[PDB]
Design a protein around this ligand. Structure first.
Ligand SMILES: Nc1ncnc2c1ncn2[C@@H]1O[C@H](COP(=O)(O)OP(=O)(O)OP(=O)(O)O)[C@@H](O)[C@H]1O
Ligand SMILES: [K+]
Ligand SMILES: [K+]
Ligand SMILES: [K+]
Ligand SMILES: [K+]
Ligand SMILES: [K+]
Ligand SMILES: [K+]
Ligand SMILES: [K+]
Ligand SMILES: [K+]
Ligand SMILES: [K+]
Ligand SMILES: [Mg+2]
Ligand SMILES: [Mg+2]
Ligand SMILES: [Mg+2]
Ligand SMILES: [Mg+2]
Ligand SMILES: [Mg+2]
Ligand SMILES: [Mg+2]
Ligand SMILES: [Mg+2]
Ligand SMILES: [Mg+2]
Ligand SMILES: [Mg+2]
Ligand SMILES: [Mg+2]
Ligand SMILES: [Mg+2]
Ligand SMILES: [Mg+2]
Ligand SMILES: [Mg+2]
Ligand SMILES: [Zn+2]
Lengths: 80, 74, 177, 48, 118, 134, 299
RNA sequence: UGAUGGAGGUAGAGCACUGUUUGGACUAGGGGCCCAUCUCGGGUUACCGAAUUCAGAUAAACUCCGAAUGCCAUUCAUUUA
RNA sequence: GCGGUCGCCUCCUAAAAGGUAACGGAGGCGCCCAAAGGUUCCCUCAGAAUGGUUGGAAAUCAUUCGAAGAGUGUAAAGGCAGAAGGGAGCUUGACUGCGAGACCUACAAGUCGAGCAGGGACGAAAGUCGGGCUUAGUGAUCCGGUGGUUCCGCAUGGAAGG
RNA sequence: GUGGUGGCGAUAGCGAGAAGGAUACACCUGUUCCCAUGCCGAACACAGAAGUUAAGCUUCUUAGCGCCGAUUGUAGUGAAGGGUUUCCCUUUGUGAGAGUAGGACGUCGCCACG
RNA sequence: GCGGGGUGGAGCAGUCAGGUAGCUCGUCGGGCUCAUAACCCGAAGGUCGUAGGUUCAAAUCCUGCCCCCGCAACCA
RNA sequence: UUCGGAUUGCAGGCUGCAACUCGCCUGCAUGAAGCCGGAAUCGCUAGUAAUCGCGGAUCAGCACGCCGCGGUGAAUACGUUC
């Protein structure tokens, strides 16, 4: 890689906030927070709310209710 | 309107195969390299093939479908 | 390095088993990743391409090569050599790192993300994903974008068949529909 | 606009060479390292 | 699916163009160089006769071995002195389509120092 | 019949000697009309012959026109002296050399075919003969 | 050309000469058209009309000799075209200056508790004499000078364009096109405006270091125009400009639909702009504009 | 005149390129008909049909080919001048 | 007579060397390039299919298929993919004095040229370079202008003028 | 047997299939080093030897394509003649293209390791 | 064959000499009027015949093509 | 825009046999044009204009209209040429 022409790159850890699952990868962005890491090495830490494990599709279960049908709505409203 | 034409350039071969020629004799006038310069033959600025040394002229085939001129001193 | 680790450990033996490879050399691998951002707006204003290039560099970690129109096209007001479109090539560690980031972070942040296409294959074992909008990558900062844009990521592998390609991408993690 | 021009040797003020240049493409006086026969060595020749 | 062209074939494509103006004669033989991942080979060839006058390589067992660069230097020294024994002084260096940068450069400089004229 | 395009507006008259290079055998039709002489044939003559043949056939069967009038011939108007360049292209012809199968017909009984070809031949300038597919 | 007399005499003599030259070219064109018209009449006549065909060729010879001695009218030098329009709209309070005091370190205070407020689409003249603080005040507004005391507030609706007095906004090393380069304008857009400022074709690749002060002033003005700001802080804009370009500048500013803070020692330019309020220095006096400007100058 | 060696693209022929061109197969595609129209998807004329393919022609300014002749030359041969 | 044409380049006519006419059939030239030249190194096209945000027949990207169906400043022919096409670095050989010998040719001209010397560019070296893939892009003499010059200088030294 | 390196018109090619790595050649491991990418150690460059014949490569099978191609006949044609002369015919010499019989999945050297 | 022209509905500019599509009448809507005309206020209407080149950029410059108009197309 | 409150979604309240065509009203959600208006044109001379509500007739329900009531409460009239 040519020198002084590429955006700064630094290794960084990632923790899924919702579940805590951890994965180490490089990125351009830097996080003031830093955490240790196996092999006894510290890296800036980027907390992410949603990851592959967190995302419902990967797990195989979906949170969404999928809404209600109008027949059922009518019965609920009118007690029928 | 037609009626124009340039002077003919008297191209073609100027020396026969098996003919003895002196150094620098023009062997073949051409546009582009219809024939290639072989041994002891140079190609001029405008594709003219000339003998670099004295000898006998020889036209051979350069491979499958290309020709070549060589000058062999005796 | 996580994705390379995952590949070599789990993915490689699993593909070997499924596809009955005589030697591990036959194992398909992600050969390279080419991220291409076609910017026709540069003709109207070159700074659109400039900012697009900057965003792409932030996303990729490598300065992009600014590809140029090989042919002048009056239809798009395009003159030959006009610097429209950029690309970046990632191999080895950078390739694996970017791919893992795409799987984990950039993909979820897509609006109403229903997964990735499962037919966008050339027919030779090489895939492409069309990202409609940026701001899904953490490095875009959701504000620096003056004009939102998209891109095309081309994953070129050593697989001969879309089937082996599909399994490999799934193993590395690909939200196929 | 392409025009004929003369390259004069700076060392001896000798107008050794004739050439031509496009004024628009080369507004400034052309300068070349050319052999000066009078001085028998390479010198800077500038258009005049 | 992606193909990686055979590096040797690409080398040969460049080597043909090199040979279009480099060729060997009895009194000015061609010094042909071949380079592999492991070893490097030098030959002195008379194309007119189509015979290799002298040869050296990292397999001669007269080369102690070492870093591939210095092995090339030893091959160059060995071929230069062998060519001198056969009375060859001037040669034309065929870089075999490689770049005159590294192992080949070391080998060529070794040949120059040990007495081949080129 | 007229070619859609021509590389050159004006063309040499040419010379017709010997047998036709190709097309001397019946290809598609059951019956064919073979030229026994060499002559120019105009698009008008081709068209007249074709119409006569088809009318007699009652739109029964198929008709192939083997020849096409590629060549163009020019002329000079009355009262114009020699010189001052070639004339403007006047018409289109097909140089037909003896042995060429000008027309073919199929899908019709033999006697109808022979009569149809006879009418077409009378329209054409060359002497002709009927040829059966082999 | 050298004339005897004054500027008006030169204009009178010059205007007459170009008038007399123009009439000469008109009559030479008429004679050429007359011959041309007859040549055409012969050209389209029947080939059987031998005499007319003969006369047509004879007149064709005269026509050729005329067309070869036909003086070319010199292309009249093109004048500048300015169309300054604001992108956004002015507010009732574009600029707020309140109790602003400033002094250059080591020198007397130029003004104390200076407080004024512009109204919007107003022609505001900063009057004064040489070395009184006029340019300092304008530098103060832009932010070049930080006020020693007080505050300067720009409404969020106010976009500002600055024309410095000494032409300090140009890179002498770069070219004309490079100087005017902006992120908001494409190349052909820049060229069209530079042509409106009399920079034609490869005249835009010239280094700014070789231009005259007047030509540089046009580049600075072009930068001001390309901003499309609604507030114009102009410090002696007509300086270095030829008299024709000055009137164009003043006339176009008069029609400008925005606020103008201007400094000018040229009486003609201020009249064209039609000043509304004048601020006298060093004695701070926000006043309605009038021929009373002369009274302040006298006093 | 013979023997030998050459340069060249004509006659002829050929379709390998470029034009011109016929019929068949298939068909992207285009045409109007109705359903559905948010004009969305059909299903249609043995509707018109590019490209491909099969078969068949054609050429001074086409050639995968290619003569007879003529031409250049040979320390050549015979005869001649 | 009217119209057309007048010099130069390319093709067909032209009859397989060369040459070969017509108010025969087609087109081009009166330049352009400071790189679009030299050299060292490096690269290979056009299209088609498949996939792919904006994006559409067709912008950029990827694989495969692809021998040239592309490109070669500019007409055509010849030639070029061992490049003459394309890219990069350095450069100015788009050199000075010539030039055995050839082609063309009524003359005047025109064309090609190894090689020798002077002094260089590139390259490690070999070696290439006296413009550009080749063939148009031009005009005799007289007369005059500019620059150089160890030439002459009407008794001599200058000058005037050659 | 393999690797370098050449000569000869592809009868040396292409396509398809099969076998091999002992050495050798390659893929192949890396980027600290010279050196590099109009981004990328992909390439070039360098360092190095964990694995694999998977590919390249080598050897072998195949006539599918491409290539070479006799004889016979014919077109044309030099020469000498004729006719009813835009053409056609005869004698003599020459003789294609096409279409085929067939040929052919190379051959001739040198070096180095076996 | 020689010329002249293709710019909003009509008549015209612009074009030479590249940067920004106008003038007169008309049309549409609304005013004024008892109503119409005139008059007043707003609005629409062309990417310049068309296809290609040149240029950073074309109504403008270059080439072709298609339309429309006048003329000519043969003389003792 | 904490202006503006159109349009729209959902959920309700009534009246009525029945509120889709086609009622009024409520809550939440949404948040339109609109930045004081060209030519022209209208009302008004004092408790008037302006502005603020309240009641009523019709009427199951339904008014920005109509009729009426009160609250606050101005500017200007030189003058009769048009
Ligand atoms: N950077 C400075 N440093 C020190 N003193 C300064 C500086 N700038 C200006 N001064 C002083 O400020 C005083 C007025 O400043 P300013 O430049 O505004 O004059 P002015 O109003 O522009 O006069 P004019 O434009 O007519 O010449 C001058 O006397 C000057 O000497
Ligand atoms: K007949
Ligand atoms: K063909
Ligand atoms: K021919
Ligand atoms: K170069
Ligand atoms: K490697
Ligand atoms: K293998
Ligand atoms: K074979
Ligand atoms: K209702
Ligand atoms: K009510
Ligand atoms: Mg010629
Ligand atoms: Mg040349
Ligand atoms: Mg000042
Ligand atoms: Mg023929
Ligand atoms: Mg000839
Ligand atoms: Mg001949
Ligand atoms: Mg070139
Ligand atoms: Mg004297
Ligand atoms: Mg005297
Ligand atoms: Mg044969
Ligand atoms: Mg407001
Ligand atoms: Mg009253
Ligand atoms: Mg009241
Ligand atoms: Zn000098």
């Amino acid at each position: 890689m040519k020198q002084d022409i590429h955006p700064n790159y630094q290794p960084v850890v990632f923790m899924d906030s919702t579940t805590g699952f951890k994965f180490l990868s490089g990125s351009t962005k830097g996080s003031s927070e830093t955490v240790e890491w196996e092999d006894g090495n510290t890296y800036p830490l980027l907390r992410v709310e949603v990851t592959s494990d967190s995302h419902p599709f990967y797990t195989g279960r979906q949170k969404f209710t999928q809404a209600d049908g109008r027949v059922d709505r009518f019965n609920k409203k009118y007690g029928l | 309107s037609n009626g124009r034409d340039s002077e003919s350039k008297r191209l073609g071969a100027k020396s026969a195969d098996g003919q003895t020629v002196t150094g620098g004799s023009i062997l073949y006038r051409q546009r582009g390299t219809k024939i290639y310069p072989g041994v002891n033959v140079g190609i001029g600025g405008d594709d003219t093939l000339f003998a670099k040394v004295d000898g006998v002229v020889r036209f051979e085939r350069k491979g499958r479908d290309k020709k070549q001129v060589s000058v062999y001193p005796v | 390095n996580r994705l390379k680790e995952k590949y070599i450990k789990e993915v490689t033996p699993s593909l070997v088993e499924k596809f009955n490879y005589s030697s591990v050399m036959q194992t398909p691998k992600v050969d390279k990743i080419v991220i291409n951002m076609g910017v026709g707006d540069a003709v109207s204003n070159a700074k659109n391409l400039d900012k697009a290039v900057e965003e792409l560099a932030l996303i990729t970690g490598q300065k992009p090569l600014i590809t140029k129109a090989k042919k002048s096209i009056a239809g798009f007001r395009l003159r030959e050599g006009m610097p429209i479109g950029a690309k970046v090539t990632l191999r080895g560690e950078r390739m694996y790192e970017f791919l893992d980031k795409l799987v984990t972070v950039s993909l979820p942040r897509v609006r109403d993300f229903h997964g990735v296409s499962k037919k966008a294959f050339d027919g030779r074992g090489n895939y492409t994903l069309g990202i409609k909008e940026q701001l899904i990558f953490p490095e875009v900062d959701y504000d620096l974008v003056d004009k939102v844009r998209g891109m095309d990521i081309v994953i070129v592998t050593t697989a001969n068949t879309d089937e082996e390609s599909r399994e490999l991408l799934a193993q590395l993690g690909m939200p196929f529909q | 606009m392409r025009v004929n021009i003369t390259l004069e040797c700076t060392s001896c003020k000798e107008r050794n060479y004739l050439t031509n240049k496009n004024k628009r493409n080369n507004p400034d006086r052309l300068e070349k390292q050319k052999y000066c026969p009078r001085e028998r060595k390479v010198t800077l020749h500038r258009e005049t | 699916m992606i193909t990686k062209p055979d590096k040797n074939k690409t080398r040969q494509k460049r080597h043909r163009r090199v040979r279009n103006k480099i060729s060997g004669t009895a009194e000015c033989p061609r010094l042909n160089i071949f380079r592999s991942n492991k070893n490097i080979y030098a030959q002195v060839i008379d194309d007119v006769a189509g015979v290799t006058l002298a040869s050296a390589s990292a397999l001669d067992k007269e080369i102690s071995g070492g870093t591939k660069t210095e092995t090339a230097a030893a091959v160059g020294k060995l071929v230069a002195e062998r060519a001198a024994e056969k009375g060859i002084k001037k040669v034309v260096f065929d870089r075999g389509g490689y770049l005159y940068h590294g192992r080949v450069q070391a080998l060529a400089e070794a040949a120059r120092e040990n007495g081949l004229e080129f | 019949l007229v070619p859609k395009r021509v590389k050159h507006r004006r063309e040499f008259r040419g010379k017709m000697r010997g047998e036709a290079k190709g097309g001397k055998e019946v290809a598609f039709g059951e019956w064919g009309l073979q030229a026994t002489e060499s002559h120019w044939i105009t698009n008008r003559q081709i068209e007249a012959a074709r119409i006569a043949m088809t009318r007699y056939m009652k739109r029964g069967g198929k008709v192939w026109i083997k020849i096409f009038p590629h060549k163009s011939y020019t002329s000079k108007a009355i009262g114009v002296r020699m010189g001052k360049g070639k004339g403007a292209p006047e018409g289109w012809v097909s140089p037909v050399k003896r042995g060429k199968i000008m027309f073919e017909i199929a899908g019709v009984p033999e006697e109808v075919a022979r009569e149809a070809l006879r009418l077409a031949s009378h329209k054409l300038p060359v002497k002709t003969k009927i040829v059966k597919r082999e | 050309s050298i004339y005897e007399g004054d500027y008006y005499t030169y204009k009178k003599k010059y205007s007459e000469n170009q008038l007399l030259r123009e009439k000469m070219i008109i009559q030479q064109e008429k004679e050429v058209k007359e011959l041309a018209t007859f040549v055409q009449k012969a050209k389209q006549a029947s080939q059987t009309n031998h005499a007319l065909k003969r006369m047509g060729l004879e007149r064709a010879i005269r026509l050729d000799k005329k067309k070869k001695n036909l003086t070319k009218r010199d292309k009249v030098y093109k004048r500048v075209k300015m169309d300054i329009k604001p992108n956004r709209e002015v507010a009732r309070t574009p600029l707020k200056v309140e109790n602003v005091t400033f002094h250059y370190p080591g020198h007397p205070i130029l003004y104390k508790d200076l407080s004024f407020q512009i109204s919007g689409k107003e022609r505001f003249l900063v009057v004064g004499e040489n070395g009184v603080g006029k340019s300092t005040l304008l530098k103060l507004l832009m932010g070049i000078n930080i006020p020693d005391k007080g505050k300067i507030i720009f409404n969020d609706k106010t976009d500002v364009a600055y024309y410095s007095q000494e032409l300090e906004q140009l890179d002498e090393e770069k070219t004309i096109l490079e100087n005017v380069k902006s992120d908001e304008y494409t190349d052909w857009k820049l060229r069209a405006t530079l042509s409106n400022f009399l920079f034609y074709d490869d005249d835009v690749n010239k280094k700014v270091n070789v231009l005259s002060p007047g030509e540089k002033a046009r580049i600075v003005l072009c930068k001001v125009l390309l901003q499309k700001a609604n507030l114009l802080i102009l410090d002696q804009p007509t300086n270095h400009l030829d008299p024709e370009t000055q009137s164009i500048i003043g006339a176009n500013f008069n029609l400008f639909e925005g606020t103008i803070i201007v400094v000018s020692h040229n009486p003609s330019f201020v009249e064209q702009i039609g000043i509304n309020r004048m601020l006298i220095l060093p004695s701070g006096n926000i006043d309605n504009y009038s021929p009373e400007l002369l009274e302040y100058y006298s006093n």
